Amino acid sequence: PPPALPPKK
Amino acid sequence: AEYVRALFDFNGNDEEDLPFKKGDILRIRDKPEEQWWNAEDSEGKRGMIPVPYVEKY
């Protein structure tokens, strides 16, 4: 699986 | 100019997101945030992409 999805600002 | 390569597939839950598949080459158009950039794919589609899912080309 992919890395963590960053939060959007 | 600035190209990145997808390390993983990405679909996104927001309509502004640009889906892509591992291996795709995307051109970076804007960096409105540190971790989410606007990019263009090989068909000319535009959208937001997560920086952790790509690497520099």
Which one of A2, A3, A8 has the shortest CB-CB distance to B36?
A8
Residue A8: closest C-alpha in chain B? B36
User: Cα separation of B51 and B35, whole Å?
Assistant: 5
Which one of A2, A8, A9 has the shortest CB-CB distance to B53?
A2
- Interchain proximity A5–B52, CB inside 8 Å: yes
User: Cα separation of B5 and B25, whole Å?
Assistant: 5
Which DSSP letter does residue B51 get? Answer: G
Q: List, in order of start, the domains of chain B with CATH numbers.
A: 1-57 (2.30.30.40)
Do the strands B54-56 and B46-50 form a parallel or antiparallel pair, or are they unpaired?
Answer: unpaired
User: Cα separation of B28 and B44, whole Å?
Assistant: 12
The resolution of the experimental structure, rounded to one decimal in Å, is: 1.5
- Interchain proximity A6–B8, CB inside 8 Å: no
Burial class of residue B8 (count of CB atoms within 10 Å of its CB; 0-12, 13-18, 19+): middle
Query: Which sign does the torsion angle of CA B11, B47, B52, A9 carry?
Result: negative
Method: X-ray
Tell me how many helices (H) and strands (E) chain A has: 0, 0
